[PDB]
Amino acid sequence: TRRTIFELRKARDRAHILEALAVALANIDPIIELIRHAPTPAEAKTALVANPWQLGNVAAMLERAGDDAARPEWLEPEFGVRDGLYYLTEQQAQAILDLRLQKLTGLEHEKLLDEYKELLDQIAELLRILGSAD
């Protein structure tokens, strides 16, 4: 414990960013359309947050853990996975805008999903460690 809470938090914080990237890659066609239509980075970020995104392949991955296990405790209820859609925070939209094109290639996409999947398993175990005395 205490070490456990630190670990769980760090895993969720990292998973939270990867989750947004994975959702973006699952919707890359309309994501880039939306970005190209935006006159500025600020407006692209606003447009990314304005409407939710379909989960696509991420839906199946979330089955690797109980409901909302990857969700940071500090995340407000209006964000994250909600009824089959994903509601991005501004920080997540900024991570999407910071993706390099090379990240779209098959192996880079798979590597990102591999890290996110591994984190979900890591998170579920850290949770299981709790676990402890009530």
Binding site: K10, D13, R14, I17, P41, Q94, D98
Partner: protein, 98 residues
């Protein structure tokens, strides 16, 4: 903290480099070091963003970016998150040439 501006306490260099900005992602705050960029008073725009704040007017010397011990970050005075895009673009320029 990412884009937090810190007062340089080393009296020797504090005159030319009075402040520095943490540019390290908060996902790595477990590290005992921070990547920072020094600011210098205005006494290449794409590499060295001009910074106008309440503390004065500075050039961000992105090419003099360096890593420092986290204990050096004891005196936060401002935050530069509105400059995020300029700062990242300058770092990208230094490394990828874009």
């Amino acid at each position: 903290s990412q884009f937090t501006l810190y007062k340089n306490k080393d009296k020797s260099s504090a005159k030319t480099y009075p402040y520095f900005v943490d540019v390290q992602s908060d996902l790595l705050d477990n590290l005992n070091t921070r990547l920072v960029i020094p600011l210098t008073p205005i006494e290449p725009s794409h590499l060295c963003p001009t910074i106008h704040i309440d503390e004065g007017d500075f050039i961000m010397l992105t090419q003099q970016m360096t890593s420092v011990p986290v204990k050096i970050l004891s005196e936060p005075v401002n935050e530069l998150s509105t400059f995020r895009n300029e700062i990242i673009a300058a770092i990208d320029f230094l490394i990828t040439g874009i």
